[PDB]
Design a protein around this ligand. Sequence first.
Ligand SMILES: CCC1=C(C)/C(=C/C2=NC(=C\c3[nH]c(/C=C4\NC(=O)[C@H](C)[C@H]4CC)c(C)c3CCC(=O)O)/C(CCC(=O)O)=C2C)NC1=O
Ligand SMILES: CCC1=C(C)/C(=C/C2=NC(=C\c3[nH]c(/C=C4\NC(=O)[C@H](C)[C@H]4CC)c(C)c3CCC(=O)O)/C(CCC(=O)O)=C2C)NC1=O
Ligand SMILES: CCC1=C(C)/C(=C/C2=NC(=C\c3[nH]c(/C=C4\NC(=O)[C@H](C)[C@H]4CC)c(C)c3CCC(=O)O)/C(CCC(=O)O)=C2C)NC1=O
Ligand SMILES: CCC1=C(C)/C(=C/C2=NC(=C\c3[nH]c(/C=C4\NC(=O)[C@H](C)[C@H]4CC)c(C)c3CCC(=O)O)/C(CCC(=O)O)=C2C)NC1=O
Ligand SMILES: CCC1=C(C)/C(=C/C2=NC(=C\c3[nH]c(/C=C4\NC(=O)[C@H](C)[C@H]4CC)c(C)c3CCC(=O)O)/C(CCC(=O)O)=C2C)NC1=O
Ligand SMILES: CCC1=C(C)/C(=C/C2=NC(=C\c3[nH]c(/C=C4\NC(=O)[C@H](C)[C@H]4CC)c(C)c3CCC(=O)O)/C(CCC(=O)O)=C2C)NC1=O
Ligand SMILES: CCC1=C(C)/C(=C/C2=NC(=C\c3[nH]c(/C=C4\NC(=O)[C@H](C)[C@H]4CC)c(C)c3CCC(=O)O)/C(CCC(=O)O)=C2C)NC1=O
Ligand SMILES: CCC1=C(C)/C(=C/C2=NC(=C\c3[nH]c(/C=C4\NC(=O)[C@H](C)[C@H]4CC)c(C)c3CCC(=O)O)/C(CCC(=O)O)=C2C)NC1=O
Ligand SMILES: CCC1=C(C)/C(=C/C2=NC(=C\c3[nH]c(/C=C4\NC(=O)[C@H](C)[C@H]4CC)c(C)c3CCC(=O)O)/C(CCC(=O)O)=C2C)NC1=O
Lengths: 160, 160, 160, 160, 66, 162, 162, 162, 162, 162, 50, 50
Amino acid sequence: SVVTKAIVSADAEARYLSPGELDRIRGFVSSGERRLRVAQTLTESRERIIKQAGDQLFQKRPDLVSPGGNAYGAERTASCLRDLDYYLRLVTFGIVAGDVTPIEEIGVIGVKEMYRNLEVPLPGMVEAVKAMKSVATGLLSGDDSAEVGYYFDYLAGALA
Amino acid sequence: SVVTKAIVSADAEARYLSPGELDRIRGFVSSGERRLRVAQTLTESRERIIKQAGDQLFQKRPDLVSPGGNAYGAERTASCLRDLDYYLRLVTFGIVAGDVTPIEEIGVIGVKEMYRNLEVPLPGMVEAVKAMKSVATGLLSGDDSAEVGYYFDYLAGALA
Amino acid sequence: SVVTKAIVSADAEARYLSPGELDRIRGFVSSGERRLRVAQTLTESRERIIKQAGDQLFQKRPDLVSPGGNAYGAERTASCLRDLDYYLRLVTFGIVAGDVTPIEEIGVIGVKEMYRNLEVPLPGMVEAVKAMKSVATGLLSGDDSAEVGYYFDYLAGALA
Amino acid sequence: SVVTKAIVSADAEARYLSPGELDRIRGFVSSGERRLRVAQTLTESRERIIKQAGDQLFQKRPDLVSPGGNAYGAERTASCLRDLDYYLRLVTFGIVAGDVTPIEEIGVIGVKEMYRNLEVPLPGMVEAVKAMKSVATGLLSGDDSAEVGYYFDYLAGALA
Amino acid sequence: TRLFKVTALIPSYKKVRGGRELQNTYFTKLVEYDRWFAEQQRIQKQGGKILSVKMVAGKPGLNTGV
Amino acid sequence: MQDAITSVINTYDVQGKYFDTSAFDKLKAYYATGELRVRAAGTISANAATIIKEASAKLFSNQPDLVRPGGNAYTTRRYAACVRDMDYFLRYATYAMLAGDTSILDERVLNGLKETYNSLGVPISSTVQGIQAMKEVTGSLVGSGAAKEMGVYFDYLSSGLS
Amino acid sequence: MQDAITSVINTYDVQGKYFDTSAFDKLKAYYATGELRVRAAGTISANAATIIKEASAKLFSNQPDLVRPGGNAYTTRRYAACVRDMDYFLRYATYAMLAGDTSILDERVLNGLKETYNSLGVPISSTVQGIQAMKEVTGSLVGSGAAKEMGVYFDYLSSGLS
Amino acid sequence: MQDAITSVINTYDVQGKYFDTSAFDKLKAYYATGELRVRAAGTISANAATIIKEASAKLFSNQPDLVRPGGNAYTTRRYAACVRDMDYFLRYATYAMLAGDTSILDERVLNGLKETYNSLGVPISSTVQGIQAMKEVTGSLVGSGAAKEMGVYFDYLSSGLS
Amino acid sequence: MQDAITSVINTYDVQGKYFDTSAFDKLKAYYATGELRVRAAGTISANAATIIKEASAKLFSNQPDLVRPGGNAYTTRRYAACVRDMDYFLRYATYAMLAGDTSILDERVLNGLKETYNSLGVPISSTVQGIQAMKEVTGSLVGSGAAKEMGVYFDYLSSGLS
Amino acid sequence: MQDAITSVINTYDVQGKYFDTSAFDKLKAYYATGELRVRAAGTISANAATIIKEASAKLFSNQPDLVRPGGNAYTTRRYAACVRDMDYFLRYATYAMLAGDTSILDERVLNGLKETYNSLGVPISSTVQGIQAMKEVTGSLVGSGAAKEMGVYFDYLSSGLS
Amino acid sequence: TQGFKPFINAILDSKEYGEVFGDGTVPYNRYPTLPAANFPNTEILYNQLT
Amino acid sequence: LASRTEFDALIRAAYRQVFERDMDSYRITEVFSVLETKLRNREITTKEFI
Ligand SMILES: CCC1=C(C)/C(=C/C2=NC(=C\c3[nH]c(/C=C4\NC(=O)[C@H](C)[C@H]4CC)c(C)c3CCC(=O)O)/C(CCC(=O)O)=C2C)NC1=O
Ligand SMILES: CCC1=C(C)/C(=C/C2=NC(=C\c3[nH]c(/C=C4\NC(=O)[C@H](C)[C@H]4CC)c(C)c3CCC(=O)O)/C(CCC(=O)O)=C2C)NC1=O
Ligand SMILES: CCC1=C(C)/C(=C/C2=NC(=C\c3[nH]c(/C=C4\NC(=O)[C@H](C)[C@H]4CC)c(C)c3CCC(=O)O)/C(CCC(=O)O)=C2C)NC1=O
Ligand SMILES: CCC1=C(C)/C(=C/C2=NC(=C\c3[nH]c(/C=C4\NC(=O)[C@H](C)[C@H]4CC)c(C)c3CCC(=O)O)/C(CCC(=O)O)=C2C)NC1=O
Ligand SMILES: CCC1=C(C)/C(=C/C2=NC(=C\c3[nH]c(/C=C4\NC(=O)[C@H](C)[C@H]4CC)c(C)c3CCC(=O)O)/C(CCC(=O)O)=C2C)NC1=O
Ligand SMILES: CCC1=C(C)/C(=C/C2=NC(=C\c3[nH]c(/C=C4\NC(=O)[C@H](C)[C@H]4CC)c(C)c3CCC(=O)O)/C(CCC(=O)O)=C2C)NC1=O
Ligand SMILES: CCC1=C(C)/C(=C/C2=NC(=C\c3[nH]c(/C=C4\NC(=O)[C@H](C)[C@H]4CC)c(C)c3CCC(=O)O)/C(CCC(=O)O)=C2C)NC1=O
Ligand SMILES: CCC1=C(C)/C(=C/C2=NC(=C\c3[nH]c(/C=C4\NC(=O)[C@H](C)[C@H]4CC)c(C)c3CCC(=O)O)/C(CCC(=O)O)=C2C)NC1=O
Ligand SMILES: CCC1=C(C)/C(=C/C2=NC(=C\c3[nH]c(/C=C4\NC(=O)[C@H](C)[C@H]4CC)c(C)c3CCC(=O)O)/C(CCC(=O)O)=C2C)NC1=O
């Protein structure tokens, strides 16, 4: 998180954290309460977000569920929705952390190799993530939508 | 400056500033007015702060103005107070800047070599900046006195 | 010693000792009796040298034994003289060694951070070793006083 | 020379010359006159030394001056004696320098490549240098003969 | 002292490399004494786990000859 | 590097002067513009890929020879390096605008860029054209006042390259 | 390393569960204590040299043989290495206090320090005494709550060496 | 580098001549001055920090503007860099004196100094004045015989700078 | 590494013998198998990504817990590392088959794999199951004859891992 | 490394006492033999290649199977490694003789040598016999007292290997 | 302050060396795109003979 | 014992990178013979050799 980055930056120079870094951490802990409120809101709306996101993805990209598509079949569509659930959990982790570092460590490093081996189309990932972003931002207020959409934007850029 | 550290940190990672760093800059920009008021309070009283810190220094360390002491003599004592005024100016600079970057670049890098070439004791410098901290935090309300004491503490730690 | 320095210089290049290195070893061993007599002379007179050097130390810089000074007090004065005893022993070691490596590795490497941790002024310590130099060279002949003064000069330059 | 080695070694550590280094240079310059008269002895009788060394080399190694040998003929034998004369002058240079450095740059670096390109056998060089060692040391006194023999030994080891 | 024999595992977190990296993760090396602080700090900063360090050349507790 | 705050600090540090009323007015002006600067920086950061796409599209439409075989932007390496340089220019223009000071543009962009490009055969006029296309795209996204401010830093880059 | 937030993230990630109520309770507990941690860290940073000097004085007064000839801390070099070790211990304990987790002590302090000291011949009990001295000196400076918090990481260091 | 002995050796080696009487006279002169040079080098090694202190004090007394705000040596960093440059000049002058040859001042010192100083805005005139200040202090320290010898190398450094 | 030919050469060099009838016979055996080996290596080279896909699919179908949270293949990084390791095993088995000798497996793959996996926490039994899964898939493509020969090196890798 | 002088200094320093009469006695013993050691070292360096040639010829005459096919010294590579090892032993034994102390031997030769030779398959006994051949050649070449001195360090190497 | 060997150690103990070259690869010309002017300066250095 | 040639190529590449060209005239092989020996038997890494 922000605290870990400040600590590792200070340790790189073999120094204590400067008053500026301490002030940055103070602002971070101040914003923590709103961050947990946002993450709680997205955690409560698990099944909704997954359901509308999957429906928009499958209507926008029928080929994925059609014969020959990567998600054809009940079990493969279930795995698709399971991946969506993974990424939504990662986005909640990013919201609490204040940065995209947990998303980066769990679901972004080596994702292209994983989906190459799985024969998962990356544009399908990008569209599913965009649909998740739309649903999540819709279920939120005007303020929360910006910071939540930032993480989905980072994730889609990582897939794209 | 806060903006300078944010930009440099982003540049070191070859990236745009994240919403967290932009929010940090937004908070610093918001608190700029309070910072300017504190800086003016410390500037308008610089003569009193210097006189009282010099006093407290010379009661707490009589050896400095005692024979064999570095500050012995009216001329050397004037140089002592002139250094104290340099550091008070740098403290006001660091207040408006929001970090200790001006303090470090103007008065901390190579200060050990300079004072060694000058035969100036560093515990004397630390006691003098502690004196200035006491005097200057006496002039301020609690919230502002804490943030000024942070810069004075950084100065004392960098001299020690 | 001189032998160790020649051997490591030869070893770094995977060679035998050059005629110059062997020549300097001969010069060292042929001078062994004279420098050994010098080391004895410094050894028997160690108490007298330490006490005169400490007296000259306190006369020249009285802030150390003045209030607010590092050597203020009786036990701190005993520790002051104990350090001088240490350095005179190291000087004898350097004389028998023919080089300043024993001094460097027992009492010079890390000395700045040590005396910084003890709030011991390095100008005061340099005055200490200069007093020791004057006293010790007083008890020696000119030919011996030259070499002993060279080691004391090395110590003075290294301390500050 | 001795002075140049001391200076570059001290400059490698960003320091002044140690008491041992200064003592070494002092002993070197105190011995300058015996070095100069040894160079006198070697220079004033260089023709006889080269002639006798050539005789000893060609008697212990008749193959060189036999047909098919590297030194066969008038001109190749002249070139052989010319190389011996080169190395004698180099030994005088090293004697005055106090170290094998002038020998090392003028006649040791790349000597193996040179003599392979010329098809001069290196054991022949070693035998010639040993012969010239014996002839030149026969002309000097024991103290000087040992010192010059160390230079001839350095040369032989480099050719070996 | 003059020599530490250090066996260390350095995993990878930043990326999965095309190179084999069996060379660089699990290793044993000889680091000279006044390099060991910096080397250990770098190994800890990369995220590795130092498995063992041993004395090989010098003698612990010696004053001279260091 | 420098920002507006550091620039005022330096001009009052060379004179050994405490801050006057004029310096406090300059600091107030920067602190007033800070919100607009952060807004523009966030907008540009969210839209960097869009800006690069559009600007490189205009550049290669006007100078098609750059991407025809043999042109300086003809290979996947050289096209990628071209759009990477455009991304660099956008990023450092955004840094400069957020700092309120063009010192970063000289220190971290313009220093040796001219003879970098001349030693590589990168056309400098076409790079300036790309920068102008980038300025036009960015102005439409950040709004009129932010467009005028961002034009200053884009024009600083263009003038330093020219 | 991982802080408290990253710690709970990793723990809930390993079971692949979303944050429960208890996870948000833990996060609220951390963010509530963060400001106290920032005062504690700033205070310790201001007085690092003082803390190390007092702790070293206490350690070498309670164990005078360490710095007398024959002791592990007898030379300028070995004494300086000792006080360097205590400086690093104090700064890393400050880091672990800000993070709210003893992980950084595992990755960047205890990661091979045990057997490094063992091969060096550094006495463990004396190093524990030095850590305890830093603990008392630092607590008397940072007050009761920050003292308990810092002491937790100090005893982590002691038990890691023990 | 190159010293007096090595200079004579190379001069005769290019000619391919054994040493004549003139070469032995030059070597005799250097051997005769060797004791004076060693004594002077020892004195300077013993008092180098002192020499730097009085030389810097004298230079900043003659030109107080250098260390007052606006001067090139005004900050802690630039004051320390000034003192470090003076330490270079003193140490390399002592090397050249002990060598009896100004070559090392050519390789290690004067090569590219003008370019560095004009790039940094370091005032070359004031640096020459500081070199002169070191010359008086060092000459007064070493004595009548060695002061003339060390002046050669200090003025060589000054003429290379100016 | 050594191939079959280099193995025969080394076994004749150790005894200092020129080649007799038996050595030429073993050589002829290798050059008889050479066309089969080259054909199998080319077939696998064309189908490497595929064979990896079915091998990983079989490994994860038979042991699903490896990729759910808590499994060592649970992350994109760790899943990518797993398939990377499997690709390495396939590539080096192909090298060994083409060479006709198993020295390359011990020299490159197996030298330090136990220490690395056990320190990392990689489960050996699952990796061995992956070796078998890869062998079964490859045998279907290479052909009945080449399948056993490639299985030889696959069991060599497994037993070295086991 | 430690010579005799540094060994005495280290003992008296860890005792923290000034030199006693026995310390000065050991120092006189060392200085007395220094000229003999320097002569022996110069003689050995003058004849190092000759010593290695005769010692290796004696070793491979007493054990011809070492360089015949199947022996550990049969190749140009391994024969070169053998004679290079003998060169190391000779040079470091000369170092130890000149130092008057064996600490350089176990510091820079003996540490890990037996394990390395065993891992390589180098016969320890044959290496000991090579050291003995070097001992005999060197002892015949230097002279009786220097023979005894060098034999001390050669026997140290032999006892460390075996 | 420290001379040559500490300076070489400072280079080789830098984080940059560890990330780019690690412990196994011989260094090489990097043709660095960043920071500004590093490319021309590096190329001038590497286009010069000894 | 095996892959001797690729160690030797890496060693000569290290010489050419650190010293900008081959240095056989200076007998680099015998100057660094112990160092090369430690590199081949894997006591040290490439970074320590450099
Ligand atoms: C926590 C981080 C993480 C991620 C993200 C992850 C992804 C992941 N998805 C998988 C399967 C899958 N994933 C998908 C999803 C795709 N189908 C369509 O193409 C869509 C575009 C797209 C969904 C939006 C499908 C269809 C499979 C089944 C693959 C197969 O059986 O061939 C698998 C194989 C193991 C299993 O099925 O349980 C992994 C490891 N694993 C992780 O540890
Ligand atoms: C100052 C450093 C230096 C040296 C040493 C040096 C040696 C040298 N020796 C040469 C030829 C020669 N040198 C020799 C000498 C060898 N013949 C016998 O075998 C002996 C073992 C041995 C001499 C003792 C001979 C016979 C030649 C003629 C080779 C030929 O013409 O093919 C040449 C080629 C030019 C010429 O023929 O005059 C050089 C450059 N040059 C230098 O610049
Ligand atoms: C060319 C010879 C060679 C090989 C093959 C090799 C393997 C290897 N695998 C590694 C990690 C790994 N290896 C795996 C694979 C395992 N995880 C699952 O349990 C599977 C059952 C199983 C694979 C079939 C995983 C998940 C990691 C990551 C471990 C970590 O998080 O650190 C690492 C540590 C560095 C890295 O992650 O890149 C190496 C060096 N190294 C070599 O030098
Ligand atoms: C020699 C290496 C090299 C390549 C390969 C290359 C590709 C390349 N393709 C381009 C445009 C394009 N490329 C495509 C091709 C895509 N359309 C469909 O989606 C397909 C999936 C796919 C082709 C099979 C299209 C449609 C455009 C026009 C883009 C536009 O008009 O907006 C452009 C933009 C400039 C121009 O059109 O002249 C380049 C540089 N350039 C190079 O220097
Ligand atoms: C062989 C290398 C070596 C040295 C030199 C050495 C010195 C040394 N002096 C110390 C204390 C001291 N040393 C001094 C001496 C100072 N008083 C004045 O300021 C003078 C300037 C100066 C003496 C000339 C004093 C006053 C103390 C006590 C400081 C304190 O208790 O706070 C201490 C701390 C523990 C103790 O009391 O002994 C050490 C380790 N230790 C070593 O292992
Ligand atoms: C960042 C975490 C970290 C630490 C703490 C650390 C400690 C450390 N201490 C060392 C030496 C040492 N450490 C000590 C300290 C001990 N002596 C006294 O008795 C005390 C009881 C005690 C300290 C409180 C001493 C005396 C030495 C010198 C040992 C010797 O040279 O013989 C060394 C050997 C290498 C070197 O000094 O350059 C290390 C690596 N390394 C790390 O990476
Ligand atoms: C903005 C950064 C900056 C600073 C701080 C600075 C300080 C500074 N103080 C100086 C002298 C001095 N400074 C002092 C002050 C010390 N004496 C007492 O012991 C005290 C412990 C202590 C002050 C609290 C004294 C006494 C002198 C006169 C020294 C002398 O004349 O030898 C000098 C030498 C030239 C001059 O007098 O103008 C400098 C450059 N210069 C800078 O560019
Ligand atoms: C398979 C790799 C390998 C090779 C090549 C090798 C050669 C080799 N030749 C040797 C002796 C010898 N080698 C030769 C050969 C030379 N005589 C003339 O000068 C010729 C120019 C030249 C041969 C054409 C001679 C005469 C000896 C005997 C020298 C002696 O023992 O004194 C020896 C030392 C003891 C012995 O074997 O008798 C070796 C190791 N050893 C190996 O393990
Ligand atoms: C500075 C001190 C030092 C020593 C002593 C040392 C010994 C040493 N000898 C080695 C190889 C060797 N050493 C020998 C010599 C032995 N085998 C023969 O039969 C003889 C009986 C005997 C010598 C008298 C041989 C034959 C090898 C080659 C091993 C092989 O490649 O299989 C190696 C392996 C690395 C390499 O070959 O480059 C080492 C480390 N290394 C050192 O750094």
